[PDB]
mmCIF file of N, CA and C in Angstrom:
data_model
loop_
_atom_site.group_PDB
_atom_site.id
_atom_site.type_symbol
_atom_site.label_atom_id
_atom_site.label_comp_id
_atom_site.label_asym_id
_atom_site.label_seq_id
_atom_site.Cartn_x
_atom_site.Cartn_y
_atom_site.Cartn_z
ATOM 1 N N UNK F 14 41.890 205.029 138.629
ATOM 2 C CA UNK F 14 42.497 204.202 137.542
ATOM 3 C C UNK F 14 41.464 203.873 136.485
ATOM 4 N N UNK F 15 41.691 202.829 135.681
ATOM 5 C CA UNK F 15 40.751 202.558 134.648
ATOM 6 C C UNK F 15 39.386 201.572 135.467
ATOM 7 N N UNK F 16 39.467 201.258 136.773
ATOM 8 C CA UNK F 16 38.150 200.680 137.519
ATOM 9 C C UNK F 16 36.879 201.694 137.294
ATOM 10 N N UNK F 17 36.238 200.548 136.661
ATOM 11 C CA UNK F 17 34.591 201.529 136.167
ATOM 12 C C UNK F 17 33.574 200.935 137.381
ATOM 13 N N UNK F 18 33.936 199.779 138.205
ATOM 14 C CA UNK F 18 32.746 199.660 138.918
ATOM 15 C C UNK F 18 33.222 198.303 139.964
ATOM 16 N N UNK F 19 33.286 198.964 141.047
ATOM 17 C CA UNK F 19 33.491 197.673 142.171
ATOM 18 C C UNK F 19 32.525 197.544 142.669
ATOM 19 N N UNK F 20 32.274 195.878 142.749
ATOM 20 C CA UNK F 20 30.824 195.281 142.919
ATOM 21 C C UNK F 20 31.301 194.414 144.337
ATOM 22 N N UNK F 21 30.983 195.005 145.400
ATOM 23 C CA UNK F 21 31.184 194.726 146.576
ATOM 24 C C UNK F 21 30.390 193.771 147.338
ATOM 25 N N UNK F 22 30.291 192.418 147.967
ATOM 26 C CA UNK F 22 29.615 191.951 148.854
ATOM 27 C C UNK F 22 29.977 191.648 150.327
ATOM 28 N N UNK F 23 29.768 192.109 151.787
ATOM 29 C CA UNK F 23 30.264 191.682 152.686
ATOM 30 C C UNK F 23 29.033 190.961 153.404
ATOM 31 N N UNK F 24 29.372 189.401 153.644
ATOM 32 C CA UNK F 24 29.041 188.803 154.388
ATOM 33 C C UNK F 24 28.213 189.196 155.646
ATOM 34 N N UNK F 25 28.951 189.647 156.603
ATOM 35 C CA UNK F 25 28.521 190.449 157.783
ATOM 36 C C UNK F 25 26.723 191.140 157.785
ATOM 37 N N UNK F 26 27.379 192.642 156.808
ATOM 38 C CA UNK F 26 26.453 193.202 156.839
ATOM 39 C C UNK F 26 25.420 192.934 156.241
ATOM 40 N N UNK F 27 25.405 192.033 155.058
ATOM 41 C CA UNK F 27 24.317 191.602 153.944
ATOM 42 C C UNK F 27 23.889 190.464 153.538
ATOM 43 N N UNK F 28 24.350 189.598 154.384
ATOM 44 C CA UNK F 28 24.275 187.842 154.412
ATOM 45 C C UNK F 28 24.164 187.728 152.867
ATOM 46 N N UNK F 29 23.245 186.735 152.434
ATOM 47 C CA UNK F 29 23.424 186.431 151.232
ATOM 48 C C UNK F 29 22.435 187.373 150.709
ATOM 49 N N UNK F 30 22.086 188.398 150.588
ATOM 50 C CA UNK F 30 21.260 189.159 150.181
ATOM 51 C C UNK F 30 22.191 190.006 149.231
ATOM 52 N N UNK F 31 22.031 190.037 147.686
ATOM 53 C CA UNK F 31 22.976 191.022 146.679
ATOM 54 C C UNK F 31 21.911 190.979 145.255
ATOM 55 N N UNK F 32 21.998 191.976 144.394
ATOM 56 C CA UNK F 32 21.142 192.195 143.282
ATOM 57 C C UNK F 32 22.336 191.794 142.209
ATOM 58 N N UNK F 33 23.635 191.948 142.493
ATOM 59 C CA UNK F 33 24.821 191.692 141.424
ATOM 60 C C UNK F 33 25.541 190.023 141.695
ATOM 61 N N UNK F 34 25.636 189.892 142.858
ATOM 62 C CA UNK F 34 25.379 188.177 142.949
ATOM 63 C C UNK F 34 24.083 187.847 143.431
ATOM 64 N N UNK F 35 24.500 186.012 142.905
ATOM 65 C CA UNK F 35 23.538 185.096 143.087
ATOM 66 C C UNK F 35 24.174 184.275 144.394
ATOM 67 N N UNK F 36 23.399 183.975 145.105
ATOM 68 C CA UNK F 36 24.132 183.325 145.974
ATOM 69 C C UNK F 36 23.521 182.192 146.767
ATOM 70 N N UNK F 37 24.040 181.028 146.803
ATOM 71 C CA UNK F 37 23.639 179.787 147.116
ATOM 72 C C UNK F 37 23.918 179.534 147.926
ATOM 73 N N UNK F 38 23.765 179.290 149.371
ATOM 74 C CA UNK F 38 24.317 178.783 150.567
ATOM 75 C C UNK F 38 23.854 179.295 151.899
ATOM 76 N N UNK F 39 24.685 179.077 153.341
ATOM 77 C CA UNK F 39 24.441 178.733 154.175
ATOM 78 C C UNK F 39 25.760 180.013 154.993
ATOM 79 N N UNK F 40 24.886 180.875 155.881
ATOM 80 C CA UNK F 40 26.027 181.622 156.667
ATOM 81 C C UNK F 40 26.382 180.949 158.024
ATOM 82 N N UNK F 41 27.753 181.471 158.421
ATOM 83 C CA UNK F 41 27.782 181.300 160.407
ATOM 84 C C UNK F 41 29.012 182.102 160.349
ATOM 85 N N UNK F 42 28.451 182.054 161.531
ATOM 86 C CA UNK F 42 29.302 183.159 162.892
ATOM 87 C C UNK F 42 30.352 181.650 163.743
ATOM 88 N N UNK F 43 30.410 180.825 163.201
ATOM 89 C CA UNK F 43 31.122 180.062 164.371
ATOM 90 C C UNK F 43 33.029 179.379 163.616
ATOM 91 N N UNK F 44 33.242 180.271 162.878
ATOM 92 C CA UNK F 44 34.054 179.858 161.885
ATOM 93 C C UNK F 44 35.186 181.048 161.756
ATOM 94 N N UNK F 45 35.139 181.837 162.999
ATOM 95 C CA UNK F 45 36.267 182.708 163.319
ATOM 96 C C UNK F 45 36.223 183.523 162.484
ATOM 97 N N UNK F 46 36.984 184.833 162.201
ATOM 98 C CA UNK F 46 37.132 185.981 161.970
ATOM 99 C C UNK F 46 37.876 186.505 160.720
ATOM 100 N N UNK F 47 37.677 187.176 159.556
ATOM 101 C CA UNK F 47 38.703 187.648 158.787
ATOM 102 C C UNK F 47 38.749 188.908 158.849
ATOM 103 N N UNK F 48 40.200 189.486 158.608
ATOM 104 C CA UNK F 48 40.866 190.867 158.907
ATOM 105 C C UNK F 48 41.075 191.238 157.841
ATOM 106 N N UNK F 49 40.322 192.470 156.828
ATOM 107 C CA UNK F 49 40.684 193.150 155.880
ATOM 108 C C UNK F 49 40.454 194.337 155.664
ATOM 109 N N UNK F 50 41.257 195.604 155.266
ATOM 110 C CA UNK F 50 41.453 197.047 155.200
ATOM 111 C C UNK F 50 41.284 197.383 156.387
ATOM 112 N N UNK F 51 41.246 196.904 157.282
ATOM 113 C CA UNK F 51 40.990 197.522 158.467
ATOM 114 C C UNK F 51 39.515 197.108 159.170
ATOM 115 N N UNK F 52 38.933 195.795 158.511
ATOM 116 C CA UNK F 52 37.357 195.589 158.766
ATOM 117 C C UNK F 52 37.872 194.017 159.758
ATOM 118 N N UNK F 53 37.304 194.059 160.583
ATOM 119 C CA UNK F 53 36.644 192.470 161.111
ATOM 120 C C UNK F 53 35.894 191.841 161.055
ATOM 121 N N UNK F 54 35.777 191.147 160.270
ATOM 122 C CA UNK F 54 34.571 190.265 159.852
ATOM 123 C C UNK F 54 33.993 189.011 160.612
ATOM 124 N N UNK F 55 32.942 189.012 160.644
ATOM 125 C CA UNK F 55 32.234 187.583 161.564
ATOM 126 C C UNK F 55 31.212 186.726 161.073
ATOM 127 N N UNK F 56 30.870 187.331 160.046
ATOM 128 C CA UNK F 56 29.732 185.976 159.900
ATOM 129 C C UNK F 56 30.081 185.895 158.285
ATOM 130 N N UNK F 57 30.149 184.636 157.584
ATOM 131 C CA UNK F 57 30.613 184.184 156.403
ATOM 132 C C UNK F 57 29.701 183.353 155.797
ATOM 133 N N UNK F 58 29.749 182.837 154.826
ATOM 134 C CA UNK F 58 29.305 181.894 153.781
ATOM 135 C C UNK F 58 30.576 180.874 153.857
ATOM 136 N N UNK F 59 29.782 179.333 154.304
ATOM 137 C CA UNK F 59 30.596 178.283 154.411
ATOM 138 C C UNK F 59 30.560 177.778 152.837
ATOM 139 N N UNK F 60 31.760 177.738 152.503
ATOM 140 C CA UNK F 60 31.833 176.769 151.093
ATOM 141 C C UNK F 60 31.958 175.082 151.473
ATOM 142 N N UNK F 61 30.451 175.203 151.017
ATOM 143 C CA UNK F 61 30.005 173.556 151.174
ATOM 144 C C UNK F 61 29.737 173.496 149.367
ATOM 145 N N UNK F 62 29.724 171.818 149.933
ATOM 146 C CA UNK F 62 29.430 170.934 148.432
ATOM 147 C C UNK F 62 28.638 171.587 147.608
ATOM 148 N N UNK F 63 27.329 172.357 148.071
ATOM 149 C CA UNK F 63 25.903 172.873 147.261
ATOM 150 C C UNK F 63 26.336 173.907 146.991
ATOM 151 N N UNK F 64 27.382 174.717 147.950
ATOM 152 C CA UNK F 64 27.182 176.518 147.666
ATOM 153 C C UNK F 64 27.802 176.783 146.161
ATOM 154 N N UNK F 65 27.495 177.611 145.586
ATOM 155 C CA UNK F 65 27.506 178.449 144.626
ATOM 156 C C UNK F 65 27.114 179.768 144.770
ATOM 157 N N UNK F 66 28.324 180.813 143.911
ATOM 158 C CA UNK F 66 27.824 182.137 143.751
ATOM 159 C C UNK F 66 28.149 182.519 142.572
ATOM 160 N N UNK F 67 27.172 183.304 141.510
ATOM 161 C CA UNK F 67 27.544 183.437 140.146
ATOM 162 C C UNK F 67 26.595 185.113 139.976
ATOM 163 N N UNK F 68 27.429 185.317 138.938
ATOM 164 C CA UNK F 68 27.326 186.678 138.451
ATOM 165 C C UNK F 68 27.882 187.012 137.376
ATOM 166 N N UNK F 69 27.352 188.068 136.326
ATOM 167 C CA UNK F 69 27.992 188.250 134.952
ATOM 168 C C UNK F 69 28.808 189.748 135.584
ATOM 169 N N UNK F 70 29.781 189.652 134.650
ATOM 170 C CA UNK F 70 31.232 190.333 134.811
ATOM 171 C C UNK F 70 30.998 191.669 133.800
ATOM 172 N N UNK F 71 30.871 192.786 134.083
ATOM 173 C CA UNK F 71 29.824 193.742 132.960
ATOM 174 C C UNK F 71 31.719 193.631 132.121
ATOM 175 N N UNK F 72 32.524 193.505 132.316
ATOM 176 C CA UNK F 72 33.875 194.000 131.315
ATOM 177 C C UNK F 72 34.892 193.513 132.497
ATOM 178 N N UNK F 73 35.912 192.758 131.694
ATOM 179 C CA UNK F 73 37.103 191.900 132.735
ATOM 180 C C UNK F 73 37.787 192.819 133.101
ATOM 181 N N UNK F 74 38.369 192.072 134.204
ATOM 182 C CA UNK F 74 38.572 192.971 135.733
ATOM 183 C C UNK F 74 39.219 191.742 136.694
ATOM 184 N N UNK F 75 38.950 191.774 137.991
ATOM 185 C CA UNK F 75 39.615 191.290 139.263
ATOM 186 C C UNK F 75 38.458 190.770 139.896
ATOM 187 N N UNK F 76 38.478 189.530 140.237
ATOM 188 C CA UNK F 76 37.659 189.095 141.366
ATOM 189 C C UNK F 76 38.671 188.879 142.813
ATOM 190 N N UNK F 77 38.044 189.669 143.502
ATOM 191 C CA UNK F 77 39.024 188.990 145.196
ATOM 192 C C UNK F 77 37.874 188.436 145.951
ATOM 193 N N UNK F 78 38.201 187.703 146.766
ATOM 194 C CA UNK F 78 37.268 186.828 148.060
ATOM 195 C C UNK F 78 38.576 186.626 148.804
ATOM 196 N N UNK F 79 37.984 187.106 149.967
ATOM 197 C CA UNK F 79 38.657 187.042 151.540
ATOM 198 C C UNK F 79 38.014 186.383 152.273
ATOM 199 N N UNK F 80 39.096 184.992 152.871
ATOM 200 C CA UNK F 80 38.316 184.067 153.714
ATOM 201 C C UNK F 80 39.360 184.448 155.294
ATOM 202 N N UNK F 81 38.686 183.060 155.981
ATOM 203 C CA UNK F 81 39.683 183.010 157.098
ATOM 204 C C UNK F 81 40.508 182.443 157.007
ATOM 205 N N UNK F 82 40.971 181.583 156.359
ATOM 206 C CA UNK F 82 41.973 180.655 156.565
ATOM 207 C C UNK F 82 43.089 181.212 155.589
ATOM 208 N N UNK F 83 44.622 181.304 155.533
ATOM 209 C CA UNK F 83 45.549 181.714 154.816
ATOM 210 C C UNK F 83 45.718 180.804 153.557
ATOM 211 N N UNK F 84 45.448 179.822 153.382
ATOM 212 C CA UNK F 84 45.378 179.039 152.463
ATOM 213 C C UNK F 84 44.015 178.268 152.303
ATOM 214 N N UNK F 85 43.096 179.301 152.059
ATOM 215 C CA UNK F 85 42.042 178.930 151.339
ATOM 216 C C UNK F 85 41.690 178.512 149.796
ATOM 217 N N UNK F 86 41.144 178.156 149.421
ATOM 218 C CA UNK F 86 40.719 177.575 148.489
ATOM 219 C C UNK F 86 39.054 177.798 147.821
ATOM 220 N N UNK F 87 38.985 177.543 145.814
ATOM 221 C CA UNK F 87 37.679 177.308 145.368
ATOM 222 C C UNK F 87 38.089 177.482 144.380
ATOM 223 N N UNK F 88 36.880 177.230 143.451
ATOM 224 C CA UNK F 88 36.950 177.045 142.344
ATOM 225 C C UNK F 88 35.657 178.455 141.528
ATOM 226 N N UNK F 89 36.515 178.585 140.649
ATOM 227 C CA UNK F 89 35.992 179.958 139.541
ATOM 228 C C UNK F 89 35.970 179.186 138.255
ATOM 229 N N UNK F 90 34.544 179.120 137.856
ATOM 230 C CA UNK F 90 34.785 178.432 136.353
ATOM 231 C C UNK F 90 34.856 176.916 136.322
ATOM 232 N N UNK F 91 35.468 176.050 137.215
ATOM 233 C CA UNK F 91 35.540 175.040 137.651
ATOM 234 C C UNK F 91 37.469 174.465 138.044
ATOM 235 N N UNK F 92 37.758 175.632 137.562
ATOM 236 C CA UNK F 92 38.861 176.049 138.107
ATOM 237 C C UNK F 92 39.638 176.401 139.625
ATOM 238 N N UNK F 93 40.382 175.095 140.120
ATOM 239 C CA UNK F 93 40.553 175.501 141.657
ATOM 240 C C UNK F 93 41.802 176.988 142.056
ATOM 241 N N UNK F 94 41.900 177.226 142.837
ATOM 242 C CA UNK F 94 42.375 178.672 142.983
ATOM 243 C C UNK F 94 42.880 178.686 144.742
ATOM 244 N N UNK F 95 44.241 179.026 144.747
ATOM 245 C CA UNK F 95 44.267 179.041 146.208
ATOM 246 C C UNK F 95 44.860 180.765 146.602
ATOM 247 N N UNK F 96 44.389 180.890 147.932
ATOM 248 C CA UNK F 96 44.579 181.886 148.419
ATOM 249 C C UNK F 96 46.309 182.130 148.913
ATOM 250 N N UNK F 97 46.216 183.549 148.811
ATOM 251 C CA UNK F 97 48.204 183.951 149.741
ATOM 252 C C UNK F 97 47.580 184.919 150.913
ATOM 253 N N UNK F 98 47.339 184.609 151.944
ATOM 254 C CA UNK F 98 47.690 185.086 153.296
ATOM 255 C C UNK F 98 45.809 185.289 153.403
ATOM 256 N N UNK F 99 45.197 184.481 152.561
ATOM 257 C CA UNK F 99 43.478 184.413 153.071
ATOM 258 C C UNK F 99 43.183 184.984 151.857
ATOM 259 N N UNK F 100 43.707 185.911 151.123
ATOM 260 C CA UNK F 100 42.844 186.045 150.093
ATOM 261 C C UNK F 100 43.155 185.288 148.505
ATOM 262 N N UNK F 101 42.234 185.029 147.542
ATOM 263 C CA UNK F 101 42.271 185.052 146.485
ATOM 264 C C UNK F 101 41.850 186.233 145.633
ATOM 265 N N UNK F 102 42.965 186.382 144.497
ATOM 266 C CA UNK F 102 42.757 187.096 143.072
ATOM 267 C C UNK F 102 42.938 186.631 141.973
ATOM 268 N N UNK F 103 42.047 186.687 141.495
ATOM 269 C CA UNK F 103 41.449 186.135 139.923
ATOM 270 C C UNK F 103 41.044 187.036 139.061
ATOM 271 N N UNK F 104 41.605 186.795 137.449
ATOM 272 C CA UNK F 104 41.730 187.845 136.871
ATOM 273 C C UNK F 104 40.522 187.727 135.998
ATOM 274 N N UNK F 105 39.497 188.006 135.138
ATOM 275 C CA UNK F 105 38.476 187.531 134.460
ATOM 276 C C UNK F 105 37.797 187.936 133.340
ATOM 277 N N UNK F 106 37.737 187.640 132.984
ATOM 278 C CA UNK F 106 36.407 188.056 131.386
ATOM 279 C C UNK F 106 35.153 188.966 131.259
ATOM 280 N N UNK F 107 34.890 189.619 130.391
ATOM 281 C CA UNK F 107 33.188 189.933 130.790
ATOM 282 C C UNK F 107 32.499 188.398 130.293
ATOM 283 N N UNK F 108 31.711 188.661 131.618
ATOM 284 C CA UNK F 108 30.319 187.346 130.737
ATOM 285 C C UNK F 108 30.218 186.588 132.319
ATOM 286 N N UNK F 109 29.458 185.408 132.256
ATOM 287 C CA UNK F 109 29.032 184.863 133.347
ATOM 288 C C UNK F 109 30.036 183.880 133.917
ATOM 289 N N UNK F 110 29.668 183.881 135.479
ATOM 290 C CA UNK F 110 31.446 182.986 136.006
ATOM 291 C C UNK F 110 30.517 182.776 137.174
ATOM 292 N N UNK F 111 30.859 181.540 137.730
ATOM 293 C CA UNK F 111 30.303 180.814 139.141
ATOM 294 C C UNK F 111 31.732 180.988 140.130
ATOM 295 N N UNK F 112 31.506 181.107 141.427
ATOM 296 C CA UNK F 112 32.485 179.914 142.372
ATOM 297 C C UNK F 112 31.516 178.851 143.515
ATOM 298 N N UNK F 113 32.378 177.962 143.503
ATOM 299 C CA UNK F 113 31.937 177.004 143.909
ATOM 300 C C UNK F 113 33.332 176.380 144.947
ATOM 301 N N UNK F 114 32.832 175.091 145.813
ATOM 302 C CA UNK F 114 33.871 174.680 146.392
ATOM 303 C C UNK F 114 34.846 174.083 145.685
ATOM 304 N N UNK F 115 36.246 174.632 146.458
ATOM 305 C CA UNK F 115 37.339 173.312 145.999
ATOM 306 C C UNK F 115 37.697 172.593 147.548
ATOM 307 N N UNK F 116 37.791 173.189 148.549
ATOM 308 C CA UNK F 116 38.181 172.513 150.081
ATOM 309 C C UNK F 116 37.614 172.873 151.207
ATOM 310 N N UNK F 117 37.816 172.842 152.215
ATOM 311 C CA UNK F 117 36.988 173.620 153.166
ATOM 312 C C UNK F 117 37.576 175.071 153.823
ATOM 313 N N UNK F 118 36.395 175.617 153.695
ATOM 314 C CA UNK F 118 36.624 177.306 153.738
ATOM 315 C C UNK F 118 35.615 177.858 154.134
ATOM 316 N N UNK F 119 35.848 179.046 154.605
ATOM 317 C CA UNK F 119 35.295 180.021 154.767
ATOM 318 C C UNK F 119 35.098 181.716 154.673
ATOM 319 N N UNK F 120 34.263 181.691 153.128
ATOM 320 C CA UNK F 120 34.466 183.212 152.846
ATOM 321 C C UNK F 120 33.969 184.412 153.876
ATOM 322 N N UNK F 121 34.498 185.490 153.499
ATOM 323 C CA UNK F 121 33.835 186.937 154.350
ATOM 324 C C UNK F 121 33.557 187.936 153.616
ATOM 325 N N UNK F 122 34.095 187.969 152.310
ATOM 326 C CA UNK F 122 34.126 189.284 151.850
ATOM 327 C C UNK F 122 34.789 188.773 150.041
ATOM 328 N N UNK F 123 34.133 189.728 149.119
ATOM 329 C CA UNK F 123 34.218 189.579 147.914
ATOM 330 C C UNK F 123 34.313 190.474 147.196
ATOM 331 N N UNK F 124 34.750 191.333 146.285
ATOM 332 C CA UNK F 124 34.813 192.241 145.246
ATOM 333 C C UNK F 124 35.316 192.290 143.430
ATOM 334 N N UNK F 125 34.189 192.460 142.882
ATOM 335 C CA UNK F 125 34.908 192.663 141.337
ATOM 336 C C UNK F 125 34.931 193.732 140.773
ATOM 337 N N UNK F 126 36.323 193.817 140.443
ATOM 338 C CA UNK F 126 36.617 195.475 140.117
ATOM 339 C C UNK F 126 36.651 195.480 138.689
ATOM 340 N N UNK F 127 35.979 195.841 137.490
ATOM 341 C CA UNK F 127 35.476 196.106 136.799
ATOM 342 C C UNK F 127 36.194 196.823 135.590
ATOM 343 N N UNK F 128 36.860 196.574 134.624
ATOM 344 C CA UNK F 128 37.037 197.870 133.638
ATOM 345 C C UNK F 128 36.765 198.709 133.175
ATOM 346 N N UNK F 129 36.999 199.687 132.954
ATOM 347 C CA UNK F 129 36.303 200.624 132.225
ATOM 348 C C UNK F 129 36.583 200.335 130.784
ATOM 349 N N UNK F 130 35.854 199.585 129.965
ATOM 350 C CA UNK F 130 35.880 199.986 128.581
ATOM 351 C C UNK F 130 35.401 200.667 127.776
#
């Protein structure tokens, strides 16, 4: 399609370690499991009060984050945002964008899919 670049982070395999996010916070394994494409996920980034993750958007596109809980929650921009069946999608701008907490959660997995302009 017109996707020029999905910027992928999974929890699991890469804790907070990414060159395309920034990432502020605290992982665990004790906060149960999320199920996506066919992946099981186990160790997450708790959205606490401090965490933050920010990154510039090279051309607007889709942000998703997959947590555990079906009605998760946070905030993009300062904007709260709730999840349908664990995940959130958010649609976005090029240029710089944070998330941060809106309730208690727990992410696993994140992707921004990118335009091609």
């Amino acid at each position: 399609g017109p996707v020029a670049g999905n910027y992928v982070h999974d929890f699991t395999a890469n804790g907070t370690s990414s060159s395309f996010y920034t990432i502020a916070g605290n992982l665990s394994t004790s906060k149960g499991t999320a199920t996506y494409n066919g992946k099981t996920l186990t160790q997450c980034l708790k959205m606490e009060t401090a965490t933050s993750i920010s990154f510039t958007a090279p051309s607007a596109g889709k942000l998703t984050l997959v947590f555990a809980e079906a009605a998760a929650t946070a905030k993009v921009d300062g904007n709260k945002v709730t999840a349908s069946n664990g995940i959130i999608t958010v649609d976005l701008a090029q240029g710089a964008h944070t998330i941060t907490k809106a309730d208690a959660c727990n992410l696993f997995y994140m992707e921004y899919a990118a335009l091609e302009h």
